[PDB]
Symmetry: C7
Subunit: 265 residues, 7 copies
């Protein structure tokens, strides 16, 4: 549990703290080039016009190549989704298996105090491996979120891995008010070479979250390999090995593991 | 309870966190095109004038087609309503059935310790199925909110499903101060091609809440199908099957379900 | 209690959350039309002048018809009053009847454990209906707030019902600085067709609170009808029926209502 | 206690919530009429000059009649004083009589369990009226704050009652920089017809707090009339009647008042 | 304790709430008269220049009379000092005498239960006045803060009493940039009749805190007069009378003072 | 402990509250003299340029004398360091001696209840002075922070004592953009007599923290003088006298010090 | 534990408080030199353009020498990383060894109460050194983070040590809009000698965090030297000496270390 909950608590909390670190350094959102003192409010109009008309013109206006790319407006907006989608398998395990694993904890704790009163009588345990001898496909419904956590983290490395080769010239784009000319065909200049403020802190943030998840994907791969090195195959681990390390979850007793020191002599 | 409370807690909390994610990225609300440096305050006057006169002119001024459409001013305002209307059936069940289901929990817990002291005597339960043999239309008054939660989520998919085909050209609209000409008929230009700032984050938010509710409406449909696969029809499930899974609600005991392991041998 | 406290907790909390939803979308408060770049501060002076001189000129300056109507300056200001006036009858019942109803709860709980020890002896209750046989006009002093809650909710539907037919042209009004001409009679233009920013979110908020209270006034009317269908008239319900449903208030016991299951066989 | 603490808790909390309702709708504080684009900062200078020179010129500059009236700068500032001066008699009673009334509560609770063990023996109280037969002028030191709460509420109705007849033309006042002419006698215009922004929400707030206190002053007058209708004069109520209703303060027991039901038969 | 802690808690809390009441109504800090549209930033430069050069020119530039008077820049800054200096003697008594007075409370409570078990035996106390017969100059180290609280409150009435006769014309002062002329001797006007914004709420705050402390200094004088009217001089009160009223500090018992009612008969 | 923790809690809290009192009255940070309406943004550019180029030019540009003095940019920045460096010896004693002094407290409390049960037997203690007869250089590792607190407070009086004689003319300094001339040698004026806003509240804050620490340095000197007047030299105080006053730390008992009253007779 | 947790708690908390001390004194982020009143919004456009185009031009535009150096945009951004990377080894030890060291604490506490009941019998312990005689490479997996904390702190002194010799002239850089000329080749000036606002508080913050870590790196080196001076080599310390000082972790008893005082006589 603890090596799983370490990642499953610290990593979306890391990503939401990093999203807030983005959110402090916002300032404004976009700047456009107003044509040399024609007003103040017309400049903010053109700026908000082009920041609203990024997604809208499906034709070619930036001549960038695959220019319908939605121009990375949404990194707090995407990172919120990715943090809560990594947060949902802990919520699923904590709201659909924690009473059942608490009953399993009560079972193994009455089993260990049964061993304790067997040692008290030394001044039945033999059946409890047979109590967990059945099929029990139900703990494989718990193991599926451990693969489902690898699913979102793998595509995040493909999502942010798209963000590097995007960011050559996907920031300075050319925008217009063509329907503004369509009113009068008289006055306003056509194109304004605007530019987003965001990639100065966004592009060098796709170093960090990418290199964190790539250097942690084998740690989540390693979550499905302790069931291989303790005499049982993945078809046969069904109840023991997803409880055997979970025997170390809450606490122990004065002789839960000191018998090994006692049986040593 | 738990598969119901999972959705009924996480989903309006999702929608209110997404409403706050909208509320951080507001900035301003609308920009209008002031006619080339005639003042500063007259520009904000025209801008607030047209943002106040969206709903008012019932005649044709945008030439958009069904242009009395109220121009999506209200998405935090609508989403607040939809979050609290999804929040109200949990409030109704928690304030009108939780003492009665707590009495049901006390009844089934004294029933299970009656089974426990029957096992203690092995070192009356036979009547308790007959205690719940009556009509009891009262739990069908609890099942109605499970349909009433499907009611609001279904129309939300029709509400946001309206929002896509709306958003072709329901953003750039044309506005005027015609009563301003009616003062003097002298000076001010007539029409100003204003534009809302909102749909750049609103329209690509009607992807998310739509696709979440469509991929969760069969999960709320599935809330009325566990009463079909356990030997009783929906006319006959009245008390057992809305308590049978609710037997797994708070906790269990050392032998509430370990008898199956004991009766196995 | 619970069907009463459901409304009496959730509805003024709804109205104060909706007042805060108004308070987020304020922006500015009013815009006026400054005459074409005569200053910046004179524009804000004229704007604050007319937003301060709404109530003051009792003569006809808007030519609107019943134009001394105070021009809806006060909807957070009125809604705060209406929320706290709906909050005061719960405060009155909780600070003037909750120790007495706690003594009533202690009386009925010693009555039910008297029934319990009567069942223990089966291995005086007959007097307790006569303990509550008197006049007791004092619980009618508790029933008066249930009518007093209907009083404020009924006039709120007449208050907001006034707000629809008001809002035809009670927003664009004409204002002046006539005493400003009285200084010099030289320079300033006379009238400025100002306009409030508020009714774009205020008028379509008098849909919501109106239709909520109209669809909840029969629910508060229904609070005085359970005392009619249980063999006693409103002159004779004095103590039983305002305690009979209040017997279901805190909790019950293992045999407070399981005797009906026991007496069934 | 409870009918006293109802007012003494809810009413200064009402006035401080209403002061904060003023504090949200502030905006700016005063506007002055800058003479037609002479600068921006000189306009704010003149505005802050006249908002600082309201109290200073003791001679006649507004020609309003009793124009040294300090021009209602201070309504959050005065209302804070009036709220804390209504808050101080509850603080005085809670910090100078609550241990002594807790000892009185301990005395009457050991008196009622003395009655309880007298009823247990039925399977000395006769002295306790003589324990409270003395003079005890000390509870009259508690009754003085009930008159001292009427003192501040009465003058508040004279304070706000002054505010109506003030507000005819005590808002638009005329101000100058005469010492500014005394530098050069050259350039600046003399008088500026400024105007406070405050009375649009201040004057129609002296409806509310006035009509609340006038419709609650007989409720505080009624706090000194229950000691008249229970066989003792105000010279003779000294200990019984300011404890007799305070017998209903914390709670009761199973037979603190059920003896009346028992003695009925 | 309680009549001391009433003042010692409520009065610096009053002064810090009044300091925050100042802190809400700040707005800006000073306005200066920019010479008729020479820039915007030069106006704020001159304004911040003169608000920084108030204390600096020790020569005569205001021609006010004793014009090195530092021009009351510091009333939140001074009032913070005066609040914490009135807060420090409660901190000193609570951190240097509260365990010793808790031991004194434990001593007098075992003394009163010794009287209680003497009354139980009626079905040694005679030595305890001799236990407190010594010199004990140590409680005079507690009485010194009661004089030290009078020290700061007395000079505060001389500090704020200086503030009235100051405020005739200590607000409008004349300031320059003479070193600015020393650059070029060409362009900038010399003197600017600036004015502080502060005394409109500062001077009529030296009514309030002055008249509060003057009407409370005899209440702190009265703190050293109860030791005179109970048979002992101030040389002989050393332990009894600073504990005799402190016998009424925490609570009492069922017969701590009801013996007087018992010995009455 | 208590006379030490009084200073060690109240004094860095005083300095951080005074740093926040600085932080409220910031406003802007520096003003520069823009040459008579050449733009707005060039003025803020020059102002931020010179506030960034204070430390950079190591040559003579202010002609002030020892003008590389870094111009007191850092008083919240320095005061934060000095507050946390005075906060660190309490952290060191609380995280490296509080369990050991809690064991010492447990030892002296079992010693005092050993004296208590000796008095109970009157109806071994003689060894406990020999238990603390050894060398114990380890409490001298606790006494070193009491000298290390005097170290930082002494240099603070030399740090702020430098700040007075600095502040003659270390505020108005002359700055330029010489590399700006190096672009064109055409347009911009060379020098701008800027001035910091800070010393109006900074210089008259080096009165307060200086005079507080000078009037408290003998109080920290007095922390190493109680070990001289109780029969042992500083070489011999090792365990008794840094525990003897620490015997008065948590509490006492009914006869921890009342034996002196008992042995008096 | 405590000398380790002192640094491991206080030092990243120091660095994050110092990062927030940076975050309060931000103001703006960069200023550029707009060419003499050509607009307002074009100035902010050029400023945001060059603050976005710092990293982008990989060719020579600053002529600084190794000018692709990314120009220290990221000191809250880097310091957040360094604080959480110093925070992660405490998280690793607290989530992967604290239950095992709690079992070790339970083992040594039952060992000390075994010594206690041996002393009670004086009115088996001999095996417990042999219980910890094995290899136990597992505590060397705890000692690796103590080296891994030295890893990040060592490179931080090389990271900030790079920052001094960088900051000669890595602040004033030259930037252009060359693609802006490529539109028209007509109007805009080419180069703008902009300058970062950050190094006035950033460069003299690389004094502090550098000199803190250099004066604390031997304290973390000293964390691996107590295992050398207590008779065992680093190959043989495996369990005793990383538990021997951890015997002083939670608390002790009345005779856990008072036996040394008892065995002294």
């Amino acid at each position: 549990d603890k090596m799983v909950t370490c990642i499953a608590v610290g990593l979306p909390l890391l990503l939401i703290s990093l999203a807030f670190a983005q959110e402090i350094s916002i300032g404004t959102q976009i700047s456009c080039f107003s044509p040399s003192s024609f007003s103040w409010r017309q400049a903010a109009f053109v700026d908000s016009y082009c920041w609203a008309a990024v997604q809208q013109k499906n034709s070619l206006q930036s001549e960038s190549g695959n220019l319908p790319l939605w121009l990375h407006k949404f990194f707090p907006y995407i990172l919120l989704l990715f943090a809560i989608l990594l947060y949902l398998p802990p919520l699923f395990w904590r709201f659909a298996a924690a009473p059942h694993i608490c009953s399993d904890l009560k079972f193994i704790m009455e089993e260990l105090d049964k061993v304790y009163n067997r040692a008290i009588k030394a001044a039945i345990v033999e059946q409890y491996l047979k109590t967990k001898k059945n099929s029990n496909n139900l703990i494989i419904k718990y193991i599926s979120c451990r693969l489902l956590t690898l699913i979102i983290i793998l595509l995040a490395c493909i999502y942010l891995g798209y963000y590097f080769s995007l960011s050559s010239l996907s920031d300075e784009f050319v925008c217009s008010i063509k329907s503004g000319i369509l009113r009068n065909d008289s006055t306003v200049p056509d194109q304004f070479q605007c530019k987003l403020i965001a990639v100065g802190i966004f592009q060098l943030l796709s170093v960090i979250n990418l290199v964190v998840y790539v250097l942690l994907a084998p740690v989540v791969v390693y979550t499905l390999f302790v069931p291989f090195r303790q005499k049982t195959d993945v078809l046969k681990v069904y109840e023991i090995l997803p409880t055997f390390d979970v025997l170390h979850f809450k606490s122990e007793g004065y002789n839960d593991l000191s018998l090994y020191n006692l049986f040593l002599e």
